[PDB]
Amino acid sequence: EEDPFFKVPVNKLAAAVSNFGYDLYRVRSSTSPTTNVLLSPLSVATALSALSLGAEQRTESIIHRALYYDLISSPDIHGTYKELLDTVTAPQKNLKSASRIVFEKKLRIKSSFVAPLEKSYGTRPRVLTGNPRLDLQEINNWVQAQMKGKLARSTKEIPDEISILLLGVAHFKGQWVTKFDSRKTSLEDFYLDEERTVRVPMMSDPKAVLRYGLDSDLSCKIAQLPLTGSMSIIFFLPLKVTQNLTLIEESLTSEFIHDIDRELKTVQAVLTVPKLKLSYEGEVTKSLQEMKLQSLFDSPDFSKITGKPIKLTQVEHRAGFEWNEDGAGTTPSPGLQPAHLTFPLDYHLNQPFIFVLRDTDTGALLFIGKILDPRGP
Ligand SMILES: [Zn+2]
């Protein structure tokens, strides 16, 4: 009566926080109609889950409902969270993801909050000093350490009015299971919309083995390419050239993506994929204020952290994402029984598309992009 996959606690928690991530993606995309969207919401959800350790029942419950924990009956959801983080940030996954809680200067933190925070989330609080330049330098150094320097350093100054600041950072550069032949990469058309076309570097595999399916309701075609480390990327490509992907965005949930994944079928296709090297640095404070989290910014109860009243004032996100032709090996070339019939398909990502990076074992959303322009911001 229940999908055995989502009965596994880590998989259920992955589904919950990834549903938070798809919600956040929808909010950001609705406010970015003409710009790329690039998010790794797991880091933001992790910052929020960690902060909930320091919250009393009311605020804790608000946070937990935003993270879809209300559908989970677990003895220790924070231990499950530690398991999930250890699984999806292992070396093979090529994903760096880090979360930080930053407190106003001179705040006195209870050790009873520091302890479970370190135990389950592997991070410790950072209390500001009041020197903007040194606080910015220290945050940049923390990001450099966590992301192996693969993210750009920030120049935005730390505001003076900060009670609680959450920081979520993520970087991904993966390796396809099946490399692209760099000799076939060339400049090709990318249709930004019905009336605009640009030239972008485009990787090509004319005989690509991928998992495919066409959704006529959403009027789009879906392809799945595996990556090393037991991950995959699922592309949603509209059938007509358009920047309007809202109907596709509305359907994205952990369970719906699991369904799509299960229903794709193996095929051979003429595949073109644009090279990607994207970055993002921004504030998601207002998006969260729109996501039933407003109470964190007025008068929440974080008395498990400190006796002085504190509140959320800022939530920052920095993300970097990259794929090129790099891959593990070439097509397997296995022995086959003779067959007469082929079923040719074309999958050309030469127009705005959405992509979702997912961990195969847990189903966790690790990265999501609306690519209106592969060249970047
Ligand atoms: Zn024949």
What's the gap in Å between 263 CA and the centre of ligand 1? 28
Nearest CA-CA partner of 363 in 271, 260, 275: 260
Compute the distance from residue 269 Cα to the ligand 1 centre, in Å. Answer: 19
C-alpha–C-alpha distance, residues 256 and 26, integer Å: 15
Residue 91's alpha-carbon distances to 172, 179, 230, 325, 358, in angstroms, are 11, 20, 12, 20, 16
What long-range pairs does 190-195 form, CB within 8 A, spacing at least 24? Answer: 190/274, 190/350, 190/351, 190/373, 190/374, 191/241, 191/350, 191/351, 192/243, 192/351, 192/352, 192/372, 192/373, 193/241, 193/242, 193/243, 193/352, 194/241, 194/242
205 vs 189, 272, 330, CA distance in Å?
16, 6, 11
CA of 184 to the centre of ligand 1 (A): 29
- Which amino acid is located at 286 in the chain? K
Instruction: Report the separation in Å between the CA atom of 203 and the middle of ligand 1, taken as the mean of its atom positions.
Output: 31
Q: Produce one character per residue of 350-368: b if its CB has 16 or more CB atoms within 10 Å, e if not.
A: bbbbbbbbbbebbbbbbbb
Residue 158: phi and psi, rounded to 5, are -65, 120
At 257 the three-state DSSP class reads helix
Resolution in units of Å: 2.1
Q: Distance (Å, rounded) from C-alpha 199 to C-alpha 43?
A: 34
For 350, phi and psi rounded to 5 degrees?
-110, 30
Q: What is the dihedral of CA 280, 283, 288, 293, to 10 degrees?
A: 140
The CA 340 to ligand 1 mean position distance, Å, reads: 4
CA of 119 to the centre of ligand 1 (A): 62
342 C-alpha to ligand 1 centroid (Å): 9
Asked if 154 and 136 count as a contact pair (C-beta separation under 8 A), the reply is yes
CA distance 175 to 193: 30
Superfamily for domain range 176-275+326-371? Alpha-1-antitrypsin, domain 1 (2.30.39.10)
- H or E stretch covering 261: helix 254-263
Measured between alpha carbons, how far apart are the two ends of the chain, in Å?
46
CA dist 61 → 34, 118, 163, 292, 341 (Å): 35, 21, 21, 11, 57
Compute the distance from residue 339 Cα to the ligand 1 centre, in Å. 7
- Report how this structure was experimentally obtained: X-ray
Q: Kindly write down the DSSP assignment for every residue of 76-131, as one continuous string.
A: -HHHHHHHHHHHHTSGGG-EEEEEEEEE-TT----HHHHHHHHHHH----EE--S-
Structure tokens at 116: 């479970």
Distance 73 CA to ligand 1 centre (A): 56
Ligand 1 midpoint to CA 267 (Å)? 18
CATH number of 4-173+278-322: 3.30.497.10
- Ligand 1 centroid from CA 270, angstroms: 21
Closest CA to 46 of 4, 112, 96: 96
**Ligand 1 center to residue 265 CA distance, Å?**
23
Q: How far is the CA of 204 from the centre of ligand 1 (A)?
A: 27
Query: What's the CA-to-centroid distance between 338 and ligand 1, angstroms?
Result: 9
DSSP string over 276-345? EEEEEEEE-HHHHHTTT-GGGGSS---TTT-SS---EEEEEEEEEEEE-S-EEE---------------E
Residue ranges per domain, the chain? 4-173+278-322, 176-275+326-371
Q: DSSP state, 132?
A: H
CA–centroid distance, residue 95 to ligand 1 (Å): 45
